[PDB]
Structure prediction request, 965 residues.
Amino acid sequence: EKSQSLPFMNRPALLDGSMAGDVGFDPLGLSNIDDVGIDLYWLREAEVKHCRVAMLAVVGILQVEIFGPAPGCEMATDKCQMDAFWQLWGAHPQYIAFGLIMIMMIEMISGIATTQGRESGERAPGDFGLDPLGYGKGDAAGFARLQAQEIANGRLAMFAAAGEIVQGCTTHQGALENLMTALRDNSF
Amino acid sequence: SSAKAELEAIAKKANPTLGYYDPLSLADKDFWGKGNDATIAFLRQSEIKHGRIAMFAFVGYIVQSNFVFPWAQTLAGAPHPSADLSPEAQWDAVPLGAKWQIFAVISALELWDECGGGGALPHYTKGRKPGQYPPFTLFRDNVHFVLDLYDPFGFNKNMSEETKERRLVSELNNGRLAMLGIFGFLCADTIPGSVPLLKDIAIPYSGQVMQPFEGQFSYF
Amino acid sequence: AAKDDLIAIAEKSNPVLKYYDPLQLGSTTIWGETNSATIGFLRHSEIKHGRIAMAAFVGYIVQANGIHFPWPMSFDGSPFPADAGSPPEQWDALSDAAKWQIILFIGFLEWFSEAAGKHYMRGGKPGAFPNFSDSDLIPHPVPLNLYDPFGFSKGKTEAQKADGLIKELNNGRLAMIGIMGFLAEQKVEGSVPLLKAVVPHYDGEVMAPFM
Amino acid sequence: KVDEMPGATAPLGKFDPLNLATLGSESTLAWFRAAELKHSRVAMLATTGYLVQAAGIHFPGMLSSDVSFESLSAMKPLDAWDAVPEGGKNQIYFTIFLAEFITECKGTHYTKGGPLPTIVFPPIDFSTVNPEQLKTRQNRELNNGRLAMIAIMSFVAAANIPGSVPALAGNPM
Amino acid sequence: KVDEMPGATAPLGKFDPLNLATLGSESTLAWFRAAELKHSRVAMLATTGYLVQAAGIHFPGMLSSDVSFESLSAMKPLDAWDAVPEGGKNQIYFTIFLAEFITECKGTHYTKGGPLPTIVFPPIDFSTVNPEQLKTRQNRELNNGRLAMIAIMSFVAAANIPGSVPALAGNPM
Ligand code: CLA
Ligand code: CLA
Ligand SMILES: CC(=O)O[C@H]1CC(C)(C)C(=C=C/C(C)=C/C=C/C(C)=C/C=C/C=C(C)/C=C/C=C(\C)C(=O)C[C@@]23O[C@]2(C)C[C@@H](O)CC3(C)C)[C@](C)(O)C1
Ligand SMILES: CC1=C(C#C/C(C)=C/C=C/C(C)=C/C=C/C=C(C)/C=C/C=C(C)/C=C/[C@@]23O[C@]2(C)C[C@@H](O)CC3(C)C)C(C)(C)C[C@H](O)C1
Ligand SMILES: CCCCCCCCCCCCO[C@@H]1O[C@H](CO)[C@@H](O[C@H]2O[C@H](CO)[C@@H](O)[C@H](O)[C@H]2O)[C@H](O)[C@H]1O
Prediction:
């Protein structure tokens, strides 16, 4: 009857309790929309993709700052987020637009699958069937934990990824550089 | 009030004229929240302990004023304490490590009353009379022979329960004399002119008569 | 029942002072094991603490007199450092290959006591060392065991066994105090007032193996 | 109640001409009762603390670091109050400030029928003392305080107005 | 029942004049309970952590790479806070930050009737001891903290306002 996360208000009607991470947090009623080609199925497919991109982006920033670039790249610089990106583009832009076309082929097909996956309810939101390791032929209670840990880490990574981009473009220093700077100023 | 009536009976047998002297009646209740029985037999054992030390300090005071030992105190040098001089300051002339062995001996020897001697005789509230003593007979049949405290060769075996009570009260009233006996010696030897007929004072004072260590071990 | 047993054995070491536990550590469950498994830990500890101090007492005397082994230990030729002439400094001045292998030796001996037999937290009795020949987790059989290799104690009856452990407990308790008492004289002058001067001072932090 | 009250002795009995015990409630009379109980104990210690401090009893040694017990050789006992230093005067009040708390923080406050103010240091166990002979003592405690409340006012008036008290003005104070 | 519990000792009993234990629900009183339990343990470590090193106890060696334990020879113990470096002052908080979690993440919180904050790193089992003797210890634990909460406020007020505390102002700090 009442939202677990907003206990002063009613729980939204379509937030059944079945998806991982569902604590009934939707105060504005966005799960209710069924117009302009988007709904709870499209919003969940959006969220899981935002999760995944942001989880990779945090490790990708921390990788080439702690350990530097991959072998075959040079002229390392202050921040690894923007300063290296325009630098590599100017250095050798072939591998970076190789990927942009390869992502483009993957996205056009995953977008067809999302529209085909809602018309016939046999594609789980987020599910591309990628389980080469077999986590999921195991315990259903243990696999339901893996579903919630993907969402919980992915939600936290969205703030961290959007964090490291914006304070990279603001301070023009590295992300671990910004953490040690903030440690110095609020030394307390 | 059985414990009260035991205190009243022995106070009549000590002085039937004056009877029951209670100018503070603190022998009918609790100090530590432990019992009227726990209070009286603690005070009975107390006054018993105060007079036993007192008598042992009157005899010890006279002999140290009188002839005292020759032949050496310690290993190196061996100056014996003074012969005529005040016993109260003969205590201060005792060396350092001599004293610490005395107090360590007094700590463990007196402790044997408290446990009752490995049990077999309870603590001073019940069972034992106040001032009794578990006769060493846990330590003596396991390691060696230390004889016994207050009965080295014991000829004190066979007495009537009526005849012990005359000697039970010889412990109190002599010690009640021996508590105020010492104070007359011990007020005389620090301040001039308070004692009636005792002008045999050693001519300076003693120096903090509540000090085990006046020399070389002082607190800050 | 692992509690009546601890009371009864401390009773047989002392008529008076039967079961002594002011901090009430004899009631814990350690990590989370059953109380009975734990009391075995507290016992097996106290024995093992009492066994080394008994061994370090006799060791401390032999280090001091000069009954050092008369040869050099290393292949290159430097002798045993009794030159420093004092038992903590004698353990200071060793090599980068002797101080290890003594700990590494004992580290096999400590370890072998868990495996190769019934563990003390699962019954058994504390301080009971299992024989090398009875277990299979060793490639080659050594000739003699660790405790009593010549087999004297098997002729002694059971009443001289439990009475023998209690004589080891109290002597183990006395020797822990003797080693500590030798430590305090080393680092604090006049820490105990019996030994006026037999120890050199040496502020050397002996609780550290590798300086 | 007015009757069966300690403090009513033989030569006057119930001494209340202006009817002050009737003036409030029962809780009012209990306040005046332990007032006079406390007024007594302060005046008994101040009257006795005036007679000595005037004959030269003189604690040996030093009161504080430089203001040692020369306060008795010359100054009157009404004086030697500013001679006591501030840190010495302070701990006196604060031991009193603590002692007024246990007095107030009992299980039942005395105007609600609870017990009178008892000793803070060393309580032991108290007036389990034969309540017939207890009533005789609380008459003895209050009457000595009644006399001491008058006497400490005599000692002040002699120190301010010379000749205000006949057989007491010829006394060096 | 406020009188029958750890913290209600002899000289005051139930000490609540302004009725704060009644002010909320039973969950409210359990919050204040373990507040005073935690306020005690911080103040007991800060009062003691002040006396010692005001006397020169002095860890041998180096605190950090160049800011070694010269913080005791001269600066007051209220100081040597900014002298401790930031990475040293950081680990302290984070060991605390971690210790505040197990305190909160127990099977039953304490305001729901669960156990009070237990030792975070060495968890010796403490379940076994005689609960009669246990009640005497939790009175000892809180009363020493009550005294230490006052004492650490004395130590701050002496370091800010000289002469704010009589027999304590003549102390080099
Ligand atoms: C540590 C000493 C000490 C302290 C701090 C107190 C404190 C207090 N007493 Mg007190 N008292 C003491 C000793 C002490 N007493 C002794 C030994 C007795 C005899 C049993 C009493 C009998 C007593 C009565 C009858 C009354 C108080 C009262 C009070 C309170 C207010 C009066 C005041 O300011 O006294 C503070 C100052 C005192 C100066 C003087 C006494 C200090 C003595 C001389 C210390 C030396 C005694 C020593 C401990 C004994 C030696 C043996 C030792 C090794 C154990 C206060 C809380 C009053 C009250 O209502 O509540 C307590 C009250 O009416 N006291
Ligand atoms: C002046 C203060 C003072 C007071 C009032 C006491 C009072 C007591 N001491 Mg004690 N003692 C003191 C100072 C004092 N001592 C000092 C300064 C020392 C030297 C450090 C000792 C050393 C000492 C020893 C070595 C022993 C005592 C014992 C006793 C007790 C005799 C009665 C008894 O056994 O009750 C029973 C005990 C109590 C009520 C307190 C302990 C309660 C235990 C923890 C649990 C209760 C179990 C059960 C209900 C009662 C005990 C049964 C018994 C078979 C174990 C009694 C409580 C004996 C004792 O307590 O026997 C067990 C004992 O063996 N004392
Ligand atoms: C020409 C040529 O090459 O020859 C040269 C070669 C070389 C190498 C130079 C030589 C040498 C020098 C050598 C070999 C030096 C060897 C030194 C050696 C062998 C030193 C042992 C220490 C043992 C210790 C400390 C044991 C402690 C034992 C301890 C602390 C215990 O209490 C064990 C205990 O276990 C019990 C009893 C029961 C258990 O419940 C509990 C534990 C585990 C705690 C020679 C001899 O010169 C010859
Ligand atoms: C046709 C079709 C479909 C479709 C479709 C459509 C319209 C697909 C189109 C998708 C589209 C248009 C996807 C854009 C992505 C842009 C990205 C990721 C930009 C990243 C940019 C990033 C991460 C940062 C960029 C920077 O600029 C920043 C912020 C700072 C600058 O200094 C420079 C840089 C570069 C650093 C459906 C919907 C599936 C339905 C049907 O089924 C089939
Ligand atoms: C520093 C600024 C100076 C301002 C100081 C002002 C003093 C504060 C006023 C003290 C009152 C607080 O004390 C608190 O009062 C509230 C409401 O009256 C009481 O409220 C509680 O008990 C009362 C009974 O009186 C119930 O009716 C009520 O249901 C319950 O919540 C609490 O039992 C009491 O703990």
Notes: Chain C touches chain E at residues 24-25, 27-30, 32, 35, 38 (CB under 8 Å). The pocket of dodecyl-beta-D-maltoside (ligand 5) is lined by residues E 18-20, 22-23 (CB under 6 Å). The CA atoms of residues 99 and 209 of chain C lie 8 Å apart.
